[PDB]
Design an enzyme around this catalytic site. Structure first.
Site, PDB file in Angstrom:
ATOM      1  N   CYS A 155       0.817  -1.173  -0.046  1.00  0.00           N
ATOM      2  CA  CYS A 155       0.037  -0.049  -0.026  1.00  0.00           C
ATOM      3  C   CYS A 155       0.898   1.350  -0.151  1.00  0.00           C
ATOM      4  O   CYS A 155       0.362   2.469  -0.570  1.00  0.00           O
ATOM      5  CB  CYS A 155      -0.823   0.148   1.218  1.00  0.00           C
ATOM      6  SG  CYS A 155      -0.247  -0.400   2.723  1.00  0.00           S
ATOM      7  N   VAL A 180      -0.101   4.420  -2.712  1.00  0.00           N
ATOM      8  CA  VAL A 180      -0.263   5.672  -2.019  1.00  0.00           C
ATOM      9  C   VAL A 180       0.605   6.630  -2.565  1.00  0.00           C
ATOM     10  O   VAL A 180       0.103   7.812  -2.856  1.00  0.00           O
ATOM     11  CB  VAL A 180      -0.190   5.653  -0.611  1.00  0.00           C
ATOM     12  CG1 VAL A 180      -0.159   7.146  -0.022  1.00  0.00           C
ATOM     13  CG2 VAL A 180      -1.499   5.079   0.183  1.00  0.00           C
TER      14      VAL A 180
HETATM   15  S1  CLF Z   1       5.290  -2.681   5.990  1.00  0.00           S
HETATM   16 FE1  CLF Z   1       3.260  -1.658   6.241  1.00  0.00          FE
HETATM   17  S2  CLF Z   1       2.713  -1.627   8.494  1.00  0.00           S
HETATM   18 FE2  CLF Z   1       4.272  -3.245   7.900  1.00  0.00          FE
HETATM   19  S3  CLF Z   1       2.829  -4.981   7.471  1.00  0.00           S
HETATM   20 FE3  CLF Z   1       3.452  -3.783   5.538  1.00  0.00          FE
HETATM   21  S4  CLF Z   1       1.470  -2.518   5.090  1.00  0.00           S
HETATM   22 FE4  CLF Z   1       1.581  -3.205   7.155  1.00  0.00          FE
HETATM   23 FE5  CLF Z   1      -0.570  -4.254   5.602  1.00  0.00          FE
HETATM   24  S5  CLF Z   1      -2.722  -3.734   4.241  1.00  0.00           S
HETATM   25 FE6  CLF Z   1      -1.345  -5.263   3.066  1.00  0.00          FE
HETATM   26  S6  CLF Z   1       0.013  -6.081   4.810  1.00  0.00           S
HETATM   27 FE7  CLF Z   1       1.057  -4.467   3.618  1.00  0.00          FE
HETATM   28  S7  CLF Z   1       0.125  -4.281   1.744  1.00  0.00           S
HETATM   29 FE8  CLF Z   1      -0.699  -2.592   3.015  1.00  0.00          FE
END
Ligand code: CLF
Ligand code: ICS
Ligand code: CLF
Ligand SMILES: [Fe+3]
Ligand SMILES: [Fe+3]
EC number: 1.18.6.1
Lengths: 522, 477, 522, 477
Positions: free
Chosen positions: A152, A156
């Site tokens: 994400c 973003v």
């Molecule tokens: S480094 Fe970032 S805080 Fe850490 S585990 Fe990754 S997002 Fe979460 Fe979450 S919802 Fe899925 S697992 Fe991601 S792609 Fe976004």
């Protein structure tokens, strides 16, 4: 204390009197815990109709979801291709969690890389990571293909996957001809199944969009099969086995069954099996393309119809009796192969088990959840068995899906006490199994906590969990099972009826109280 | 193998890399020396991961939500952002607790704001605020809320601090904003630090002006035992039989009240330096409370740490220490008499997080075993300092080990046992090498104290000597 | 009373207050029941070491057998030939019971006839019954063969089957060349597996003894397979599958898999599938004959070795890992076909499963029972898994068998706490699971009553039943399972580990008491 | 189907037989005519079975041990002979009871002398005597022993009567010899007879000299309800709500004390005439106790039977009879309103043992169903007498029906439902015809009384209208 010849793990160790007293003193001394009367009273309240109304009023808070995020699905899709490394452009934390989640379900290695974007990349973009990442991955793990999704963070800040990959090639970090298909897989849209769809479409586009001119529909005499997000190895195997029994030429597009079930014979194989690039390139020459889980393969469908020109037929997931029939009949129509003696017989075997077990299955009430195609197929089979699916929950489902399920329910008298819920979570489901109690839940391992809560109110209120779905972490090797086709319906029937009889056995085991009904023969 | 054979092993492995990754990884792999201590004499750490190499490392959210905050049982912790992070970390870590889940405790639940695209476009702050009211209604016995930031929160300019103050005052409740976005730092480690600062800033000081707590000369706190499989409860029982009063224990089986009483104790006993040293130094700085590291892993370490802890108090604690040591003696010697013969001589390679790679060596040695390699996901140079004096001459050390490197080192060193994580387990089992999970304890434990040693030994034995290992080669091959 | 919208069957109906009170008055007024205190006191006594000693001193009384009588097995053997009617010379009551015993295990029709010997035949012999019986059978159900066995009435009176059948042909009741193999099957000798052996050996003799002159060992290039008494459909299937995968020509002698698993497709099929008479006549031309269950195929072995001149190899039942290896290597050597890639991979998948589940299996203690071959295969697999089989009971076992099992046990450290019992029954086994308590039982449905008694003493003393064996009457469709081969080993391992995890979940489901250890991931 | 088509069907089926069986079987197959009200004038019964025709019948041991003696809960019954008979009949019959099994009750256990070749040669009387002693040691709360003879006992010249007399005196214990060898008679029927004679000679008299039992004008016994699925308890509740006192109930959930008290009662209420008329006649002649048949199957028969029973007493009982009737009226009316619409007009064929083929017809009629063919395994002509009048004109009747006959009749009559036994069930299911077990009640029940009718209607409905029956034809055939 331990007795050396009879060592105790956490259970039942901390039940020793000295541990109990210690735990009592800790609580009373420093935890400042609500009194036990208040805890009981709030518990009671959380089981009520009053609390359920409040719970279903939530707009902003989600509790105990029954879904995951896109890139998880993008990874699984990618693992289904020949010597292919999945590669998630963005943050590495995501990747540690994708691999663990799958390790624990399949009890197998699961290979996937990140390009480790940090605060630096948050500001200047992930271009450099992508160049170094592609070069390092190719050299180190020597894949024939690298399939790129996104976390994400990368979404973003608007990282341009397309341009970044082209430049990596232009600037010589990986060869021009080397395959690097990609897809945007934002975690804040849809769920894991949507990522599977996005990734697959991105891989199909990569290999076919620019080469459509020499393609002729039907020319290769095969049917393409797209499984979708699938975490039972038995479901890839059954589909192959049924089409082979029919003498139908086919191409399973995304086939991870080998790489998720390698032998323990003294070496680690990072890659195994999987759909070949030649198979993906040649796929437009097929007679048609069948989608096994259409309700999360919309984007793939539009590409296949819009670019390959296959007239993707309108088929439900081949689960339960009617829909497995319809799948086989459609495949016969397209391929021109007759449905053979073997499968006709297998069908009749399923029907025989249905006749043998209908008396214990009749009227039984189920709460269930999962992904939308799996849920509706379980619903269909339950009705075919004379069971009542009363609480039907699909957190990642939509209005259109709900409408189709409502229509399946209305075509059977066994549907009349059923409600479908979309956008709701396992905390909503907890309330439902208190206020309108079913006999069983059918679901993944997260359901074990709902069973626990029900038992806490009292034995008469307990709703046992029957584990079917994903993920399953608290039992071993159930990922080898099958839920599609007649074989799968045979397994689901057996599990359902034996869970019923096992429970009846438990209720009738009390000597001189309930064992009058503890029958040898059922 | 001699030093030279390891040295050339490191070179052979590096040849596969392109130049840039090659030069970096050279600095993170080393051989241990008989004289030279001070880490930076031979290895680098706590740097960025090279992209595309399959690091085993996680993120700062893992360090903060999954590690420090998540175990705190009477609070609700919000995975703030999209759905994945909170789902993959739901109950993956066995930080055991006593409570009535969904009512007064909430550890194994997954609370989330499940971001959709509207929340990226407009920001998540209004949703966060509505989410907090919904939590108060539905879970009225929660004693505080934490907001664990996932990746998108910082990137779209949300102000969780402001939501947290405003709703904190409006509702008379402790609401902790934590900026543990996964793109911060390079590993779980920065997540520890951020989580400690948030503890400092929002909870630890709540009872600074309060004097009702009735203290004794013997009050301690257990800091940074996360109670994996009950580890912390097995350490606690020993500290109390020694006549100490454990006023606070966190994060494992930790309540918010126990955190708030921590400034009132006479001594902070720190299980995990890496994760909790920040709050430990802040408490000495601000309250004058000393801290010490301790190790209850194996009888040798447990005994030495019980003595060192006792020594900080009067003669009556020192006498009770000796009664505890004498009481458990026959129990742990019977574990040795039984399992040491079955493990004597066998060689172990470890790879874990920030503490255990050095902390468990003594327990293996108590069973006659030899650690021929160890390394950390996210350790700093001070961790490596303490490690070199604990490991044998000419052993292999590895920082932020890549998937390729770990596989290749193992092929060549041929250890009898590997202790690592779930991402590593099924790889080495396939290579016919017995494997024990050394984060999760492979669903077993506790491994702390004397009661823990009994289980630890059973567990290394059951796996190292299992009949399955003889069966990998089909008899027609 | 019933509420018409929620109707109650016996459970929970008789728990209604009005029934409970009526049941109490029946007992207090007229049953002259021993006081509850005395009942409790005698129960406790039946769990003691003192009572176990008196129990194992029995010489005359048998309580709760773990065996059946010869003719049951003869029928099942006969059910395995093409269009064949099993036919039991003697009293009809035996036949009603054979059929209904199998109906309840397979949930399928079972066809068998009697010649209804009565008091008159008691005086004058059953000659007329045989003559009219064969003619009536042949004309009415049109079998291609009638396989004759006996009930104990006909053994005691001394009916001469050979003469009786010869006279029936001489006098024209059935055609001269109509096949009527026969065997003496006395219920007071050995057991049901013995009937299977006697029937088979009588059938092999019928088709081969007098045509031996033209036979040459190996001229048909096949291997003969004799399965023995077998009530899992998967065990037939898996053997065929594995041999087909190796490209080994084979002949399965007695194959009931089709007639015990017909489709519910609108017609009843009395006969299906099965070993043809041509395959029985040609059996001497095979390279060799492999006995899948040799400890009940002794007479068949004497016949095969003495008359066919096949060097029947010394193979244990192909159960678990080493004995499936040995079986495949022996078949490779006999046939000159190599073990193929597919089965090597299947094997390593089994070992992978063993690596993945060994921590939960380790040191787990088992009581178990069944027929001799099945019991030794289970014991062997348990040792390979790191389990301790502590009580091994074989009611129909002999001293030589027991010596072979003791040797197996001595070759593993996991056997050190094991004892083998022959001639003992499930009342003996009840004592064993009280005085030297194991973690689980592995057995048939009769063991649900031992589990009940254990639980009556207290939850801490309960020993759960895991259902593997014959007969299984109180679950559905488990008769479709597999216990032989790598497949069978995979199914047993899965069943064993999940029974252990299921039970741990039950023990850890108490909120704020034991649920600290109620882990999502195991 | 008309009379002429049925009779035509009968001769069509007989074609396949050889002449001897043909001629015998013709006499056991008939079309009912309400113009002849006298069994013999139509059909023959209670003759030997034709060999090799696949009769459904059992033996005298099944009739005596399986049916009459086995249900008696506080006695131990020995299957005396080889191992088979006791094993196949272990807990296959659902004669429900209340007790502590293995301690004061013994119903579902299998006790046997397990004959070997040596017992055939030397006889089993010495082994029987030792078995009796081992039983007293291990089961001290047993209140009696029966010895149920299997085929070989009579054939080798054993004298179990002598062992029973001598061992009964030695131990002051009731030991009942039963000569129910399976070669005796033609069916289960003679087993009933022999077992009633054994009750008479060895148990029923034990209290002829005692005068301590306090009696009332309302004392009855329930004779020959074997309590399948609780059947007798649902019948019993109605007799007690009607003001009668049920002094004895056997053999389902029967104790030996209540058999011995039966001669104390004022009326014997007989559910199964076929199995228990022998003892009921003996009791009328010796004790002056009248008996009457009754039927609590379906509300019509239940209502009629309650009235007929009440009619044997005074006004107060007749009053309670009408109150019991009014009480359950709404409950059974609702069952009818719900299920009769779903079952109306559907046609049933039955095949059972010696009572149910006529006894359950009323219940089917109360749901608007039609019994178009019935038949018995081992009924006598007085049973066919009662049948012809309860069955409609031109219905098929079959006695000791062979497998072939039953399958060919069904193929042509094409009933909507079949009610028979386990040996028949899976046949007709395969042919696509809904099937219900009318011995075992398909693991359901009770079917007796008002409470059982509810269950009975649910069961017929769940099976007759199950969605599985539309699925037998693959859509491509
Ligand atoms: S480094 Fe970032 S805080 Fe850490 S585990 Fe990754 S997002 Fe979460 Fe979450 S919802 Fe899925 S697992 Fe991601 S792609 Fe976004
Ligand atoms: S907190 Fe750390 S990775 Fe010190 S993030 Fe990690 S429960 Fe490890 S080596 Mo998982 S610095 Fe604890 C750890 Fe050690 S989660 Fe546990 S095992 S002793
Ligand atoms: S009519 Fe006779 S009393 Fe009736 S059921 Fe038959 S034997 Fe028994 Fe028993 S052991 Fe087996 S089943 Fe027999 S052949 Fe001997
Ligand atoms: Fe695995
Ligand atoms: Fe069937």
């Amino acid at each position: 204390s331990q007795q050396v010849d009879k060592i105790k793990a956490s259970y039942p160790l901390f039940l020793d009197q000295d541990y109990k007293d210690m735990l009592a003193k800790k609580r009373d001394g420093f935890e400042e815990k609500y009194p036990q009367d208040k805890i009981d009273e709030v518990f009671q309240w959380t089981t009520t109709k009053e609390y359920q109304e409040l719970n279903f009023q939530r707009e902003a808070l989600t509790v105990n979801p029954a879904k995951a995020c896109q890139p998880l699905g993008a990874v699984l899709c990618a693992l289904g291709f020949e010597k292919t490394m999945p590669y998630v452009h963005g943050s590495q934390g995501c990747v540690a969690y994708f691999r663990s989640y799958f390790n624990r379900h399949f009890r197998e290695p699961v290979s996937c890389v990140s390009d480790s974007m940090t605060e630096d990349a948050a500001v200047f973009g992930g271009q450099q990571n992508m160049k170094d990442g592609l070069q390092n991955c190719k050299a180190t793990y020597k894949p024939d293909m690298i399939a790129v999704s996104t976390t994400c963070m990368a979404e973003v800040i608007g990282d341009d996957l397309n341009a970044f990959i082209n430049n990596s090639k232009k600037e010589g970090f990986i060869p021009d001809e080397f395959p690097v298909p990609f897809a945007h897989t934002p975690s804040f849209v849809g769920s894991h199944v949507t990522g599977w769809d996005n990734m697959f479409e991105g891989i199909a586009r990569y290999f076919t969009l620019k080469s459509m001119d020499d393609k002729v529909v039907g020319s290769n005499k095969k049917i393409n099969i797209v499984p979708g997000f699938e975490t039972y190895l038995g479901n890839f195997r059954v589909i192959k086995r049924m089409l082979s029994e029919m003498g139908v030429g086919y191409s399973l597009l995304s086939d991870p069954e080998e790489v998720l079930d390698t032998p323990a014979d003294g070496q680690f194989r990072m890659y195994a099996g999987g759909t070949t690039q030649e198979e993906m390139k040649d796929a437009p020459n097929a007679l048609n393309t069948v989608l096994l889980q259409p309700w999360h393969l919309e984007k793939t469908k539009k590409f296949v119809e819009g670019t390959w020109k296959h007239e993707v037929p309108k088929l439900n997931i081949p689960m339960g009796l009617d829909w497995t029939d319809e799948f086989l009949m459609k495949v016969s129509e397209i391929s021109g192969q007759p449905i053979p003696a073997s499968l006709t017989k297998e069908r009749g075997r399923l029907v025989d088990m249905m006749t043998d077990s209908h008396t214990w299955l009749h009227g039984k009430r189920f709460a269930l959840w999962g992904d939308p195609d799996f849920v509706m197929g379980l619903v269909k089979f339950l009705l075919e068995l004379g069971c009542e699916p009363v609480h039907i929950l699909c957190h990642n489902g939509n209005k259109r899906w709900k409408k189709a399920v409502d229509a399946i329910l209305a075509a059977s008298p066994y549907g009349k006490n059923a409600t479908v819920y979309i956008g709701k979570d396992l905390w909503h489901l907890r309330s439902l199994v208190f206020t309108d109690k079913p006999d069983f839940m059918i679901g993944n391992s997260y359901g074990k906590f709902i069973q626990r809560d029900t038992l806490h109110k009292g034995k008469e209120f307990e709703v046992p969990l029957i584990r079917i779905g994903f993920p399953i972490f608290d039992r071993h090797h159930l990922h080898r099972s099958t839920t599609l086709g007649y074989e799968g319906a045979m397994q689901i029937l057996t599990t359902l009826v034996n869970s019923i009889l096992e429970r009846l056995d438990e209720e009738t085991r009390g000597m001189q109280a309930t064992d009058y009904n503890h029958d040898l023969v059922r | 193998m001699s030093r030279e054979e390891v040295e050339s092993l490191i070179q052979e492995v590096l040849e596969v890399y392109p130049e840039k990754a090659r030069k970096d990884r050279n600095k993170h792999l080393a051989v241990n020396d008989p004289a030279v201590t001070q880490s930076k004499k031979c290895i680098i750490s706590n740097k960025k991961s090279q992209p595309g190499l399959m690091t085993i490392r996680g993120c700062a959210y893992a360090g903060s939500k999954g590690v420090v905050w998540g175990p705190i049982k009477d609070m609700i912790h919000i995975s703030h952002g999209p759905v994945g992070c909170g789902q993959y970390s739901r109950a993956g870590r066995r930080n055991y607790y006593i409570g009535t889940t969904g009512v007064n405790a909430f550890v194994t639940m997954n609370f989330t704001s499940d971001f959709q695209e509207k929340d990226i476009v407009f920001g998540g702050d209004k949703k966060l605020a509505k989410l907090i009211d919904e939590v108060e209604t539905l879970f009225p016995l929660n004693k505080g809320i934490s907001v664990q930031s996932e990746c998108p929160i910082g990137l779209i300019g949300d102000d969780i601090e402001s939501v947290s103050k405003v709703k904190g005052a409006e509702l008379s409740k402790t609401i902790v904003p934590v900026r543990c976005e996964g793109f911060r730092g390079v590993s779980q480690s920065l997540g520890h630090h951020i989580a400690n600062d948030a503890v400092r800033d929002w909870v630890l000081g709540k009872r600074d002006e309060d004097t009702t707590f009735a203290s004794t000369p013997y009050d301690v706190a257990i800091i940074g035992d996360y109670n994996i499989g009950g580890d912390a409860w097995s350490s606690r029982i020993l500290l109390e039989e020694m006549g100490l009063r454990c006023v606070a224990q966190w994060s494992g089986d930790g309540s918010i009240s126990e955190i708030e009483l921590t400034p009132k104790v006479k001594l902070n006993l720190v299980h995990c330096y890496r994760s909790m040293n920040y709050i430990s130094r802040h408490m000495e700085e601000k309250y004058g409370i000393p801290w010490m590291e301790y190790n209850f892993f194996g009888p040798t370490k447990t005994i030495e740490s019980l003595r060192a802890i006792a020594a900080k108090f009067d003669e009556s604690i020192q006498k009770k220490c000796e009664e505890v040591i004498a009481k458990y003696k026959p129990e742990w010697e019977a574990v040795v008499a039984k399992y040491r013969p079955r493990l004597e001589g066998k060689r172990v390679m470890l790879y874990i997080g920030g503490l255990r790679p050095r902390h468990v060596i003594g327990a293996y040695e108590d069973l006659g075993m030899e650690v021929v390699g160890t390394g950390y996901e996210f350790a700093h140079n001070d961790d490596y300092d303490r490690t070199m004096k604990e490991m044998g001459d000419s052993t292999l050390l590895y920082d932020d080990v890549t998937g390729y490197e770990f596989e290749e080192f193992v092929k060549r060193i041929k250890p009898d046992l590997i202790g690592s994580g779930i991402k590593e387990k099924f790889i080495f089992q396939k290579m016919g090498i017995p494997f024990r999970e050394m984060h999760s304890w492979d669903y077993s434990g506790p491994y702390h104290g004397f009661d823990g040693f009994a289980i630890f030994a059973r567990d290394m034995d059951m796996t190292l000597n299992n009949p399955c290992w003889k069966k990998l080669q089909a008899p027609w091959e």
